[PDB]
């Protein structure tokens, strides 16, 4: 049982803590803050995954394509608020 | 693709039937790294604003409730505080 199973999230709290350390955002970082951040990353990634999978289910495609990700960003208004400036490509 | 295998673990967790492509997974990984960069830089700027030298989870809390839309921000705070209270209760 490492820190990842101790936090109950399959996203790595240890890697979040390490990449917070290498960034030199501050010389001291807490223990609850990487747990908090990886839970936020869990929520955001799981939500956009669920919307993109639902958009794949809408056109009865068994396989998710970046067009389904684009539909997930466009259809949801708050994702357009979060991701309006960025464009995504290679498709 | 350092964060990609755990995206795949979440995708198997929601339902194991579908499978992610390369390009959409790269878009998801760049999303998660971008959101990580925005939380970490924004909290570092708040640590400079309040002149503290330690990164705490509470400035992560207000930073997520800064950049995310509000109805999504409260859900991110709720799942994050459940995860960090479970982490602290496991100690």
């Amino acid at each position: 049982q490492s820190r990842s199973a101790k936090a109950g999230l399959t996203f790595p709290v240890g890697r979040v803590h390490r990449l917070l350390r290498r960034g030199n955002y501050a010389q001291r970082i807490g223990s609850g803050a990487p747990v908090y951040l990886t839970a936020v990353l869990e929520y955001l990634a799981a939500e956009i995954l669920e919307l993109a999978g639902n958009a794949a289910r809408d056109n009865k495609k068994t396989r998710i394509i970046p067009r389904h990700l684009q539909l997930a960003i466009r259809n949801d208004d708050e994702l357009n608020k979060l991701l309006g400036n960025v464009t995504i490509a290679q498709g | 693709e350092t964060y990609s295998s755990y995206i795949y673990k979440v995708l198997k967790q929601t339902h194991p039937d579908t499978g992610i492509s390369q390009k959409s997974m790269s878009i998801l990984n760049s999303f998660v790294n971008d959101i990580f960069e925005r939380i970490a830089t924004e909290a570092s700027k708040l640590a400079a604003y309040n002149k503290k030298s330690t990164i705490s989870a509470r400035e992560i809390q207000t930073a997520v409730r800064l950049i995310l839309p509000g109805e999504l921000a409260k859900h991110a705070v709720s799942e994050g505080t459940r995860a960090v209270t479970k982490y602290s209760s496991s100690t």
Binding site: E47, R57 | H75, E79
Partner: peptide, 17 residues
């Protein structure tokens, strides 16, 4: 919310419509 979604109660009739 065990599903951990903003509109987990809202997506079903949206998919239906």
């Amino acid at each position: 919310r065990t599903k951990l979604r903003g509109e987990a109660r809202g997506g079903a009739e949206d998919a239906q419509k």
